[PDB]
Amino acid sequence: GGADQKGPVFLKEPTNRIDFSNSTGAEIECKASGNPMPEIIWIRSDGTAVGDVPGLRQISSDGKLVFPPFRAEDYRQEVHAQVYACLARNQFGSIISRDVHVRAVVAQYYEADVNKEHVIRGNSAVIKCLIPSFVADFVEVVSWHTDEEENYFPGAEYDGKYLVLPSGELHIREVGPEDGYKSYQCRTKHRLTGETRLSATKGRLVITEPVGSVRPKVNPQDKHQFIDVELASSYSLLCMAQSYPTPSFRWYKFIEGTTRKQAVVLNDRVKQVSGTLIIKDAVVEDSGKYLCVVNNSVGGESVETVLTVTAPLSAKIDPPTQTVDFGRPAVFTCQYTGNPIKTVSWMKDGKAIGHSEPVLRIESVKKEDKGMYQCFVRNDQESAEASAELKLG
């Protein structure tokens, strides 16, 4: 061989996740350059080569791993709920792609629902579109509809009263008896198929008119929130509480690892609506534990929220290529981004090596040490990898 040979590099790396209906099917693609041109092989989670399954899984020699449309009775967890990867190899070495979370979704009929929202006069209301759990991963709230033929969409507040939150709930401030004169139903959309649907049931506000004074009460299921949202996405933090007189809402952010907290700063990006905090754009800096203190003249209450700002994982190794003499040490530094990072690991020609350090070190180079070196970074949801070639001389 000699030189001029280059280790494989992914021209097009498969996606981290491909969700698709059984009625659509899917295809994931892998392309790798290099000299000589490398061989593309699809492998399962356990490292073995994937076999063709007639009608369900077919290897197309274009590099594509195809999952044809199929009927519900032909659903195979081995095929359709699996993590795949692309192995690329030539005489110089071999690399493995990031995890490819393949998830086929059998289409199912479903009905969203809306229940009666009980609220004290003057307090803000939050109407939830109840989506069945077995479609919650694909069904989102597009808009809300009223029997008065009124429609509300995500964007800006209507008449300074009605606001569709980013999280899909319909926020209504200063509720009075007259607001209970209409019923609310949500319009949901399946992101795979693309169809829209009105909830099978309507929801109305049940206004109470308390006499005397009542303290801020939060439902036990609302005292602790756990929210997830990715970069550059709009989101909202609920602080649902009821009282009379109407309560005030103050947000804080804990210092990591301590009980000490600091007041949340309001601005162009971070605005507050009653007790709901609205952020136009999420930065990883936003992550942490929040506190929402609610107050009226009789008592107080609070809501804790753990916010996690996920970010796409990326990685590259320094240097991309290095030639070191025999006996001399070889160094690989893995640089990565995204959030969170739970595990770092290394690979060499498809074989797990080293440990969880960001800097891989070879003390004394041998001829067997040459080839491709990879660095994988991972969290619960996705992964990313980077390659680097080591030559001798």
Ligand X SMILES: *[C@@H]1O[C@H](CO)[C@@H](O[C@@H]2O[C@H](CO)[C@@H](O[C@@H]3O[C@H](CO)[C@@H](O)[C@H](O[C@H]4O[C@H](CO)[C@@H](O)[C@H](O)[C@@H]4O)[C@@H]3O)[C@H](O)[C@H]2NC(C)=O)[C@H](O)[C@H]1NC(C)=O
Ligand Y SMILES: *[C@@H]1O[C@H](CO)[C@@H](O[C@@H]2O[C@H](CO)[C@@H](O[C@@H]3O[C@H](CO[C@H]4O[C@H](CO)[C@@H](O)[C@H](O)[C@@H]4O)[C@@H](O)[C@H](O)[C@@H]3O)[C@H](O)[C@H]2NC(C)=O)[C@H](O)[C@H]1NC(C)=O
Task: Pick the closer one to a second copy by CB: 160 or 177.
Answer: 177
Instruction: Report the interface residues with ligand X, using CB under 6 A.
Output: 22-23, 69, 71-72, 99, 106-108, 293, 295, 300-302, 343, 345, 352, 376, 378, 380, 383
**C-beta atoms surrounding 68 within 10 Å:** 16
Q: Which of 236, 228, 318, 215 is nearest to 280 (CA)?
A: 236
Which of the choices ligand X, a second copy, ligand Y, none does residue 115 contact, using the CB cut-off of 5 to 8 A by kind?
a second copy
* Residue choice 50, 53, 83, 106 for contact with ligand Y (CB under 6 A): 106
User: Could you tell me the smallest distance in angstroms from the CB atom of residue 355 to ligand X?
Assistant: 7
User: Could you tell me the smallest distance in angstroms from the CB atom of residue 22 to ligand Y?
Assistant: 4
* Cα 182 from Cα 160, distance rounded (Å): 18
Amino acid at 185: Q
User: Could you tell me the smallest distance in angstroms from the CB atom of residue 163 to ligand X?
Assistant: 25
Within 21-40, which residues bind ligand Y (CB under 6 A)?
A: 22-23
Residue 331 lies near ligand Y (rule: CB under 6 A):
no
Instruction: Look at the alpha carbons of 191, 192, 198, 199 in this order and tell me if their dihedral is positive or negative.
Output: negative
* Cα 347 from Cα 358, distance rounded (Å): 12
Task: Pick the closer one to ligand Y by CB: 22 or 82.
Answer: 22
Task: Pick the closer one to ligand Y by CB: 46 or 73.
Answer: 73
Give me 90's structure tokens. Answer: 């030539």
Which of the choices ligand Y, a second copy, ligand X, none does residue 383 contact, using the CB cut-off of 5 to 8 A by kind?
ligand X
Q: Which of 276, 304, 301, 269 is nearest to 289 (CA)?
A: 304
User: Could you tell me the smallest distance in angstroms from the CB atom of residue 82 to ligand X?
Assistant: 12
Task: Pick the closer one to ligand X by CB: 295 or 333.
Answer: 295
Residue 66 lies near ligand Y (rule: CB under 6 A):
no
User: Could you tell me the smallest distance in angstroms from the CB atom of residue 283 to ligand Y?
Assistant: 40
User: Could you tell me the smallest distance in angstroms from the CB atom of residue 211 to ligand Y?
Assistant: 7
Which of the choices ligand Y, ligand X, a second copy, none does residue 308 contact, using the CB cut-off of 5 to 8 A by kind?
none
Positions that interact with ligand Y (CB under 6 A): 22-23, 69-72, 106-109
